[PDB]
Amino acid sequence: SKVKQDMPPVGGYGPIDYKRNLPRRGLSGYSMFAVGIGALLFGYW
Amino acid sequence: QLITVDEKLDITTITGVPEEHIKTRKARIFVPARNNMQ
C-alpha cells in the first residue's frame, strides 16, 4: 500500500495572518472636543 | 613570584570530606580484571 503519513493538503494551507492589525477608530480631536464643550454649555444654561 | 613550599600535598582539610571517610577508608588501586564471559 502507498505510504500514508501526516502531510499538508496537496494544494497547501490557506494564508495565515500574522502582521499587527490595530484598526483606527473614533472621531477627530476637534469633534470630540466640540461635543464636550457643547455638553458643558447646555449644562451651564 | 613563586614561593618555595616544602611539604607533601595535603588537601584533606579543604575537601569538605567528613573525618570518618578519610581515616577509616581503604582505597584499592587496580586495573580491573577482564570479565571472563567476554
Binding site: - | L9, I11, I14, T15, G16, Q38
Partner: protein
C-alpha cells in the same frame, strides 16, 4: 552527500586553522597548543599566566573582536597533575565565529579573574569556585553561588559522591531543619555499561 552522515565543511576548517596559527604567532609567550576539531571548533590551550593577555587580545584586537563571553566553565580530570581544566567559550559577532580558550590549575593554585575582560565572568567564576573549588584572584566578590549556606566540599569534583555527605530533615524536638549523615532507603545502583570491545579505532591510544 550520504543521508545519515554529517557533512564536512572544509572552508571553515581552513579558516579556523589559519586564525589559530595567527593567534599562536602573536602570543607565543602563553600559547601551548592550538587545534581544530572535525566539526570545526578552534581551541587555544594556554598557560594560566596568559588568561588576561590572551582574552584581552581576543576581545579587543581588530581581527578578533570576541566581544561576548558565551560560557566559562571547568572540567575535573583527577588523573592529571593539574586536575582542573578551565574553559572559556567566546563569541565574535563581527566575524560570526566562536573560539574556545583552555587553561589549567590545581587545588591550591589560583587563576587570575577575567572579570576585567568580561563582566560576564563574575558569576561564572563564582560557580567554578563553588562547584570545583578553584580560587580566582582579585575577584570582586567571590563566594558560593549555587550550594547551600555553609555547604562543605565542591560537588562537581569527580571524587565528591553523587548523594553528598549530609542530608536535611525537620526535627520536631529542636523545631528546625537539621543536617545529618546521609542514609538512603535505596542505594543508587552503579551500572557497568562500557563494552569490552573497542568502538573507535581512530582514537586508539598507543601502548
Amino acid at each position: 552527500t550520504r543521508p545519515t552522515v554529517r557533512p564536512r565543511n572544509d572552508v571553515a576548517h581552513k579558516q579556523l586553522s589559519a586564525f589559530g596559527e595567527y593567534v599562536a604567532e602573536i602570543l607565543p609567550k602563553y600559547v601551548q597548543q592550538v587545534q581544530v576539531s572535525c566539526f570545526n571548533e578552534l581551541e587555544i590551550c594556554i598557560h594560566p599566566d596568559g588568561v588576561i593577555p590572551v582574552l584581552t587580545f581576543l576581545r579587543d584586537h581588530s581581527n578578533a573582536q570576541f566581544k561576548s563571553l558565551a560560557d566559562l566553565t571547568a572540567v575535573d580530570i583527577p588523573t592529571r597533575q593539574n586536575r582542573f581544566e578551565i574553559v572559556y567559550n567566546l563569541l565574535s559577532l563581527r566575524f560570526n565565529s566562536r573560539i574556545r580558550v583552555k587553561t589549567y590549575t590545581d587545588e591550591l593554585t589560583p587563576i587570575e579573574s577575567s572579570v576585567p575582560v568580561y563582566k560576564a565572568a563574575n558569576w561564572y567564576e563564582r560557580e567554578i569556585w563553588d562547584m570545583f573549588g578553584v580560587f580566582f584572584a582579585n575577584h570582586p566578590d567571590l563566594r558560593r553561588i549555587l550550594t547551600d549556606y555553609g555547604f562543605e566540599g565542591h560537588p562537581f569534583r569527580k571524587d565528591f559522591p553523587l548523594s553528598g555527605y549530609v542530608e536535611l530533615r525537620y526535627d520536631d524536638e529542636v523545631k528546625r531543619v537539621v543536617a545529618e549523615p546521609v542514609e538512603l532507603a535505596q542505594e543508587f545502583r552503579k551500572f557497568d555499561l562500557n563494552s569490552p570491545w573497542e568502538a573507535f579505532p581512530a582514537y586508539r591510544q598507543p601502548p
